[PDB]
Design a protein around this ligand. Structure first.
Ligand SMILES: CCCCCCCC
Ligand SMILES: CCCCCCCC
Ligand SMILES: CCCCCCCC
Ligand SMILES: CCCCCCCC
Ligand SMILES: CCCCCC
Ligand SMILES: CCCCC
Ligand SMILES: [K+]
Ligand SMILES: [K+]
Ligand SMILES: [K+]
Ligand SMILES: [K+]
Ligand SMILES: [K+]
Lengths: 260, 250
């Protein structure tokens, strides 16, 4: 049971590194988001007061319960007639979000039957889509293997892999998203990263804004791009332990010599 | 590539799910969307000083309000959602540098968290191994897997959902719904435990840490069950065609 002691040491150290990494990212995001927050938090109260004052004739407090009744929309007399969010197409993009575990959450089920089905549908879809993604990844890895046909040559081959990768699966689809969805250059690249890393905040969605040839390419862009980041995230993880183990040899060697 | 036709089965599984969700969600959509129209007209008539016009400006500036959070701790939990690939989206980055940092922070954190979760999973798999090597011939393997899934759904689904039901104010289904959506790394964000003061939220993120390793094992077994079912349906298709050809010969 000595190897179990050796495992628990490594596990606890990784968890201490993860916490540090989380603390670092925490401080950086809040040092990047708190400023625009407080500006918006004060300029929304300016608009509250300047439209309570212009119209004190509401039962003034209901503005806040009104806003609550509007955060439930999370309509107007103009275009009181819309299209669905669970139409013949969006439900098949939402079934895709469930099995891919990207879960943008822009439209989530509200029926108890829908919630229970979504649970069973995920528990069966996540493994099934895993076999699909594995088959697609093996297929594309052999397409790359055919096209690439000692250690220095294989580093060059990994470089040209990552290059065509960001070209086909990052550059081109982001430009397509920038064109049709009307996003910026960063918003497109941000959307590509958040989608194919299976994070999917839902702040940007390709099928959210209201050609029907658009989407069949989207979910099958998503399918193959997931195989791509799967390889890329695996290479990044491999890079992390190589750096991690050689920083461990350097610290042990640093300490040991102690400037002679 | 004949095996790679799983694609087509996945597309069916999607088309099937599609027809089910629109048969489960588009109805109440209409009920909700017609009960919103009634509310608006109930607000212009009941408040005649507010006109058609002031309402539109109000709705616009609140849809803009859709775009305290990022506090000393909520940014830590955002980072937790980033590396776990759960990404509730309840609080998303808006700064240009915040977006780029979020990109880089994910590309580097997701592998790191993968190593952590792998270490926690191996550690918990051996903790499980100690208990079951004691409680646990060919048939017994099924009972052992039953005891795994049974006692795991207790610790990582039942008990934390009851905790969420009481404390967070959800239903039994909303709790179980949240548990699955979270620990399957899907995370729509419709329900978030700490999305709606340093003790409820770290206990959850430690739960999340260990429950992810739990569903990871559960999802892998289910995939293995699917593999067994698929091979045994293939051998049954070969049986059916073989005797159907037998019969045609007769
Ligand atoms: C990002 C942290 C770098 C050092 C890792 C922890 C060293 C103990
Ligand atoms: C005991 C192992 C510590 C490793 C820290 C590495 C920092 C880059
Ligand atoms: C859930 C039922 C799917 C039908 C099985 C597919 C056999 C080719
Ligand atoms: C190859 C046949 C797939 C059957 C899947 C059924 C899962 C309920
Ligand atoms: C409430 C149960 C709904 C059934 C969906 C398969
Ligand atoms: C040590 C097991 C914890 C289950 C929640
Ligand atoms: K998500
Ligand atoms: K989300
Ligand atoms: K994952
Ligand atoms: K995921
Ligand atoms: K996700």
């Amino acid at each position: 049971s000595a190897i179990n002691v050796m495992k628990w040491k490594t596990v606890s150290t990784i968890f201490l590194v993860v916490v540090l990494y989380l603390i670092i990212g925490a401080t950086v995001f809040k040092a990047l988001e708190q400023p625009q927050e407080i500006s918006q938090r004060t300029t929304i109260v300016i608009q509250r007061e300047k439209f309570l004052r212009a119209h004190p004739c509401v039962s003034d407090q209901e503005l806040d319960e009104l806003i609550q009744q509007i955060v439930a929309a999370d309509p107007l007399g103009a275009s009181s007639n819309q299209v669905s969010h669970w139409d013949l197409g969006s439900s098949f993009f939402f079934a895709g979000t469930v099995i891919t575990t990207i879960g943008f959450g822009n439209i989530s089920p509200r029926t108890e039957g829908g919630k229970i089905f979504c649970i069973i549908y995920a528990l069966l879809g996540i493994p099934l889509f895993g076999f699909l993604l594995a088959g697609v990844g093996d297929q594309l890895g052999t397409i790359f293997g055919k096209g690439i046909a000692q250690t220095k040559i294989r580093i060059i081959s990994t470089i040209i892999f990552i290059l065509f990768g960001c070209v086909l699966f990052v550059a081109l689809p982001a430009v397509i998203f920038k064109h049709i969805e009307g996003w910026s250059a960063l918003d497109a690249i941000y959307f590509v990263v958040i989608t194919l890393t299976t994070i999917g905040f839902g702040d940007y969605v390709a099928g959210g804004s209201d050609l029907d040839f658009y989407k069949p390419v989207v979910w099958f862009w998503i399918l193959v791009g997931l195989a791509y980041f799967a390889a890329v995230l695996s290479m990044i993880g491999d890079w992390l332990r190589v750096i991690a183990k050689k920083t461990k040899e350097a610290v042990g060697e640093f300490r040991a010599h102690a400037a002679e």
